[PDB]
UniProtKB/Swiss-Prot annotation, chains C, H, K:
Originating species: Latilactobacillus curvatus
Keyword annotations of the record: Antibiotic, Antimicrobial, Bacteriocin, Disulfide bond, Plasmid, Secreted
Range covered out of full length: 19 to 59 of 59
UniProt entry tagged with the keyword Transmembrane helix: no
Keyword set includes Disulfide bond: yes
Gene coding for it: curA
Source superkingdom: Bacteria
Functional note: Bactericidal activity; inhibits closely related Lactobacilli, Listeria monocytogenes and ivanovvi, Enterococcus faecalis, Carnobacterium sp and Brocothrix thermosphacta.
Gene Ontology biological process terms, A to Z: defense response to bacterium; killing of cells of another organism
Protein name: Bacteriocin curvacin-A
Cysteine disulfide links: C11-C16
GO cellular component: extracellular region
Compartments, as annotated in UniProt: Secreted
Family classification: Belongs to the bacteriocin class IIA/YGNGV family.
Curated annotation (Swiss-Prot), chains D, G, L:
Known function: Imparts immunity to sakacin-A to naturally sensitive host strains.
Gene coding for it: saiA
Keywords, sorted A to Z: Bacteriocin immunity, Plasmid
Signal peptide: none
Protein name: Sakacin-A immunity factor
Organism (species): Latilactobacillus sakei (Lactobacillus sakei)
């Protein structure tokens, strides 16, 4: 079981992961670091390290771009690690925790968006502080916002630790095969949204043909992705050299 | 006169880690930006009107990749030091140089730090962690933090020492060409990734025609010993079907048209729905549920 | 029998492993996509 | 949505469309005209194509890295989708 | 055998396929419709139906374009399906008749042009009708130019019925294997004529390089025709955009 | 005055089925076109000179896709009804509107109806018909005719209701781009079909050299039972052969240069032959006899 | 060939080359000069590349959908091969 | 042993069948070329 | 053994190969010819002819271009043929000599340049010969200036015959397996030098993208060299027509 | 007056065999070119100064393919006969027509004779010789020499009969088009050869992971007799491993990046080294030794 | 067991032979590049 | 590099840069400036890219196949690497 020192340490690690989810500076929020810390403070170290390596492989390409924000690997890692410690099955629950991470990652994305939307009141209070020229209120409220971004993940962790090992083991054993299978399939379709958003940011009548050429060339499986990129750069350079002559 | 000492620059360094503290959607990183500049605004101006002027100035819209903001930090510090010591800079060069630097540095930082160095360091750490070596997360934290701290401090010092004499030689006659080549390359590679990384595969079978003689190998007349394998391999190489039934799936019917047709359809639908003001969280949750149902219906 | 979770790791019913080739392909494609998008977005 | 936001956006687009240097920028003229039109209908423009901010960078760089007040105050007039999925 | 009602009924359909072989309006000369009518009026329905299904597949792409005339599916369907009934071998003789449909399809192409050349004489008669303003004179002679196309198929059908089942089964049994085999090989080469007259209408020094790439890209068997066409559109889109900038 | 009623428009509809009635090569569809116009021109003009004037007019060169002529038929009836009641139209606008429409409507008509709609409907009817299904032909006659009478009738009313006020807005700025872009696709897509759809293969063998040890599997040393098959797949996977002889054919010798080389030669030769004033009926009749002889000499 | 055809073709081509609007179609001039030249030798031009008819539509559309008498009567002066094989 | 007649149907010595894959490619290939050539003809 | 009639005849053939190795006129230096003459005079005819046939394939593409000199097939042919004759092993020793024909082909590349550099001094003697109008002083030295090119091949051959059949058999048995194996691997790495010289003469920022596509297009095994060439010309034709529009 | 006979033209032809006689690097073919001209110039100029003027003249830099020099040889003889009899030509046209001809005729000579004619004859003649056939070498000497003497003789007389009336119509409007189009193909075709014809193959293995159940064929439960082979190919067809070990070599890791990666580095390094003033005999000799070492350490 | 020597001839430890297909491909690539080498030179 | 060669090359290129015709070919004027400088530095230029000789043909053909003395005597100033490997 988990004693008082262990639960406090778990909670503070979760809070720091919530802080680093948006701070994006020390990257405790990464699956390897977060799962390692949770396993170290719970006593079940190696299963947590293995799980964190697995999620980091899963979550290699999640990086917030502009207003677009990734599915919050901090909550996914923290919640998967806590599932993994409380449910038992050190190396056996690796697959179950990895399966539960992705919807938990989407839930963390929702939570971080809700928090970033609530941060407008903080920015407005800072506007007022600028109107009155107080540095201290700025510092206090910035600390306060960092605190709520940490508690954004410290809270789901607290509620999960509130739900004892009994019911979490029951939920882990009461998982239909089709639920996990369909969740994996749905996770395998997600990148369509991101590709569509990038295309929408890039698509013009002058570039749709190049999209078609690249898409059709992807069907020759001997060509490698580096080779496809080389073909793309070559077409781009030829097009620019020709269009510069075209302009004059 | 109002020269900034090394201590205040180091304090700005330490405070820049919280550059993403507030992160509202209206003004993106103005909270952390203004927080990083509090020592500068303290040490430069002492009147109540001037502190309010600086704070209202630095609560305006700011966003970039948080690591590559350090050269902006330095140029901003140089401009504000000039403003404090007397220079006709009036709300137009502070914001002007700031906004000029936000864009291109974000577009050069998002690849370097997010999608190029972070995933390689993460892959190394993940391979190490799954191999049972504790050295994975340790190496990851050490390397990423060393890279970040060195880059941020050195870039801040350069941005301070270089003044606003870097952006003058930043004419926009070439960024157009860079963007256009970028768009050509990106559209090509995104077509390739649509075909190759988005898997929309259908399971159900369609046709199971029963083949005539001479189509399948018919493992009854095969020789017994050191010649059966020979004849089996020759009949396989000539194209005879290894079974007396030919299986045709809907995936094969789509693939006969073009590989990745369903993936392209989903990509187009996501583009159309995002254009139609659908929050991508709803689209992704709906995609998860769609996967759940289509696997329940034995489609995917 | 093996559930694709992308970036090289699929799973099994009791064990999950990474396909190193797919990890390499994903890292290179992510590199290209991030570079092109960052260059075009500006 | 917010009525004060709509009125201020209308005012800022109006004063932006009168500065000669901004007037020259036809690419920015399009976005300013469209944003003023949407503010005229009490809606906040949604740009799934993140075009406005890169354009403000382009104009600022074309004007000796100098920017007026109206573009700065309109920097926060856009929606800019916020639910990234990644490249994977 | 065929009684007197059937021998005339096959003539009525035979004339109409020649009537419809030029009108191209109700499509009675199509193999699926033409073969079906001969089988229905003779009692051997299903063997004629499947031949119609088989032949309609071969005659999918035959359509007159401008002055060019398609391989006369009215003769290939009507006259081949008759030998299918007279020669016996209902389902066994679906293969036998199909082999001689294509050379018959060519044999009709000879006869349609000879008829389409005699239709020049009628309009020379009809031009006089324009010189006197007679609405009756044009109508009557048009029925002639419509009737002559029908008997263009009923006359060959008359001899194949005049040459009854006696010599018809002898010819279908005295068929050398190679006469069948080489005719199939020749049938798969004829499409080179149609491409050439189409290429001759489109080939220019500007577009000759686009022929070579498409020919060479056809050597990668993982590409489909749709994918090759997508590459086809994209170069066309890129070439036009690059050429209008250059020319102006 | 000389208005055209609904009834006479339907008789024009019925007679248009004969639009290909005469089909000489000098003026292709003049008979079918002139025959279709009699129910209107009977009432539109009543003098012998006037009836002669119309009949000489519409006997000139007219040819297009017979389904896409209905919008011409409406506009032609629009012009002559206006002409009969008094309008300065004389031999320049009557032919000019027609000739401006026959060409471009055919090039949009031939793909839609001949090479797209007909094969799509034809495949469905054939696939049913080959399976012994009587519903094959019944669908095909229903589908093609239901599609045809709707388009041919409805647009004929449209051509009459729109006058010649749709032909003004048909300027050829777009048309010089459409055909030129069409040629790029066509020369491309016919290139791919030439490499593929032109069946030219050569049978005869050239060299049958005898392989040394280590080249073929040598099915004498294979293990017997659960390990003989093992070494059979791995030796083949390394490139070992299933026979002790390497068979080389003339097709491979041509294929070693580029696939489809013999198809291109025939394709170029047909190009050369038609330019040399050779009637394609002789070439194709020749192309059948060539298949007879080359297959007899064991060549193809 | 037919002697009444050749002379009238020589009549219509000689008539077409003097109308101011047809000469502007330099592409059409090439067709007429060869058509007259072949008619000048009692032979009828062989239009295996089906170019003459598409051009007469291009010129007509370029001339407000109006056509003179000489181009119309010359439409039957061409051969236009007639032995299609198809696309298959 | 199977004489090709195009459009997916070759034949045998006692039965002829249509191949759906070759029928589908011919239904598409003629569509693409027919549309382009018909457009290039005007 | 080799008698005195052969040793004179052997060197003279080797001398003429050196004589013709620079003339490039009567082609006595070619492996099929040069090997054949050594075998004809020495009595070991067929093993030399096969070696000549074998070596000609390795030397099919060696031709001097400008100042660049081909890897001296005159020395490789002569040295291998004498190696093949002196050491015995007529047909068994076809392989062993071939293994050392390529490295000596390089050894003549060293020798030919040292000879082609001393041929400078003769023309310096010849420049003054133009300063006096001496026709004969011109002819004499040119005969001399040809002779040492034959000497460059007859001198190693003179030393190879000086080192009689004894030690040549010892070295051909004292050849380590790896000394043979590595040299062939180095042989397939040579063409990196020749391409680099040609690419250096042709590479510009305008044609570098065309290099990348051709490199990437080489990764699809179904394309042959001819097919890759057709693609290259088609871009070349398209590029020229597109850039002439833009420039004028 | 000073006409040149048929006999003197033959000796010039006979002497052109030695056109490469001297071959110094300072002036490539001047000695052979000057030697070739002795029988003409002796019969042309008789003064000592005139002989000196001709000999100083033709000792200057001359180089081309020695077969296509005959049209230069004729045109040079055309100008000298005109010059000897009296023609205001002064050392500007004499070198000018030559230097205008040496360059471009080499760029047609080198492909025709060296890299096209020579190996086609050579590969044909080698194929006989490798088979122990004496018809090989005899044909090669006959084929190459019969082609040579007719071409070098005929064009010598054509150059004499055409003079400087051929290079006048050799304008540079076309010459610039040819080379630039040549470079597009060349960079393309050398690109394809680099990916293929440059052998840099690495042996060593990296990873040898042990496969789990369901990955390999498991040759213990296979059926015995007429059903063992059936399930072997079906397990083969679905991707099950023919052995219980998956071997990943260094070549796979580079190949997973792109094929031919190690070859592109070498030629680029040769590009870099040759730019760095390294004589290629050092690079090639070094390359042979590299093959010796990298095979010794089991690297290649 | 067979070391490549180019243009279709590799060798064995006692006998060497020609690969005709690779002999043919060698002539093709030498022809195409050699034509452009001389042409791009001028 | 020889001392008589360096001075002669500096002599010949110097007179080449003063002829009006050689000046027009801007490709050659960039070349000749390079020829002086490395001759001015007592080294013989190493054009591993064989550019100088083809340009002499390019200039000569543009001048009605006429060449002066300075370009001809500079034809032997090149190094032109000399260790071909082939295409194989
Ligand atoms: O778009 C660049 C930049 O935008 C936002 O500020 C955040 O998502 C950052 O992590 C990102 O680097």
């Amino acid at each position: 079981d988990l004693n008082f020192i262990q639960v406090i340490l778990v909670i503070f690690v979760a809070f720091l992961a919530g802080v680093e989810g948006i701070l994006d500076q020390f990257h405790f929020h990464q699956p390897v670091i977060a799962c390692t810390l949770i396993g170290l403070v719970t006593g079940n170290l190696l299963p947590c390290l293995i799980l964190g390596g697995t999620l980091q492989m899963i979550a290699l390409g999640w990086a917030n771009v502009g207003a677009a924000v990734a599915p919050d690997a901090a909550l996914a890692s923290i919640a998967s690690a806590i599932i993994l410690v409380l449910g038992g099955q050190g190396k056996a629950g690796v697959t179950s925790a990895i399966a539960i991470a992705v919807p938990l990652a989407v839930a963390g994305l929702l939570l971080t968006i809700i928090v970033r939307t609530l941060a407008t009141g903080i920015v407005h209070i800072m506007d007022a502080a600028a109107k009155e020229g107080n540095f201290r209120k700025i510092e206090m409220w910035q600390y306060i916002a960092i605190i709520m971004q940490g508690v954004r993940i410290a809270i789901p962790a607290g509620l999960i630790l509130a739900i004892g090992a009994g019911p979490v083991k029951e939920m882990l054993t009461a998982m239909p095969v089709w639920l996990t299978d369909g969740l994996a399939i749905g996770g395998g379709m997600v990148v369509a949204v991101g590709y569509a958003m990038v295309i929408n940011m890039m698509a013009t009548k002058e570039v749709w043909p190049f999209f078609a050429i690249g898409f059709v060339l992807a069907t020759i499986s001997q060509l490698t992705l580096i080779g496809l990129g080389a073909i793309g750069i070559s077409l781009a350079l030829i097009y620019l050299a020709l269009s510069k002559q075209g302009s004059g | 006169q109002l020269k900034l000492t090394k201590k205040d620059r180091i304090s700005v360094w330490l405070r820049s880690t919280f550059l993403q503290g507030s992160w509202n959607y209206e003004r993106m990183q103005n909270g952390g930006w203004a927080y990083t500049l509090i020592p500068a605004l303290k040490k430069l101006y002492k009147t109540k009107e001037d502190r309010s002027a600086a704070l209202v100035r630095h609560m305006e819209f700011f966003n970039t990749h948080p690591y590559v903001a350090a050269p902006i930090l330095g140029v901003t510090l140089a401009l504000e030091e000039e403003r404090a010591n007397g220079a006709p800079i009036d709300d137009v060069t502070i914001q002007g140089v700031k906004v000029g630097m936000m864009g291109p540095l974000a577009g050069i930082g998002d690849p370097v730090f997010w999608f190029t160095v972070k995933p390689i360091i993460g892959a190394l750490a993940a391979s190490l962690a799954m191999s049972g070596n504790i050295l994975g997360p340790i190496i990851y934290f050490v390397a990423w933090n060393a890279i970040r701290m060195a880059f941020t401090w050195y870039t801040q010092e350069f941005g301070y020492r270089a003044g606003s004499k870097i952006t003058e030689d930043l004419s926009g006659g070439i960024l157009q060409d860079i963007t256009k080549g970028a768009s050509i390359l990106g559209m090509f590679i995104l077509g390739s990734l649509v075909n190759r990384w988005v898997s929309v595969k259908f399971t159900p079978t369609v046709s199971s025609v029963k083949l005539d003689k001479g189509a399948f190998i018919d493992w009854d007349k095969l020789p017994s010993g050191a010649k059966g394998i020979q004849s089996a391999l020759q009949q396989q190489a000539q194209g005879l079907s290894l079974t007396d039934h030919k299986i045709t799936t809907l995936q094969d019917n789509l693939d006969s048209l073009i590989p990745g047709l369903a993936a392209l359809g989903l990509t187009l639908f996501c583009m159309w729905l995002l254009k139609k003001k659908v929050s991508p969280i709803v689209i992704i949750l709906g995609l998860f549920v769609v996967g759940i149902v289509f696997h329940l219906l034995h489609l995917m | 029998m093996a559930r694709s979770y992308g970036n090289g790791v699929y799973c099994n019913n009791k064990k999950c492993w990474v396909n190193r080739g797919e990890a390499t392909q994903s890292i290179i494609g992510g590199m290209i996509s991030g570079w092109a998008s960052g260059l075009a977005g500006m | 949505a917010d009525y004060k936001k709509i009125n201020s956006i209308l005012t800022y687009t109006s004063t932006a469309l009168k500065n000669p240097k901004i007037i020259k920028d036809k690419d920015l003229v399009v976005l300013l005209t469209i944003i003023q039109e949407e503010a005229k209908q009490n809606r906040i423009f949604y740009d799934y194509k993140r075009k406005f901010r890169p354009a403000v960078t382009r104009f600022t760089i074309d004007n000796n890295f100098e920017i007026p007040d109206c573009l700065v105050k309109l920097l926060s007039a856009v929606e800019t989708p916020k639910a990234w999925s990644g490249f994977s």
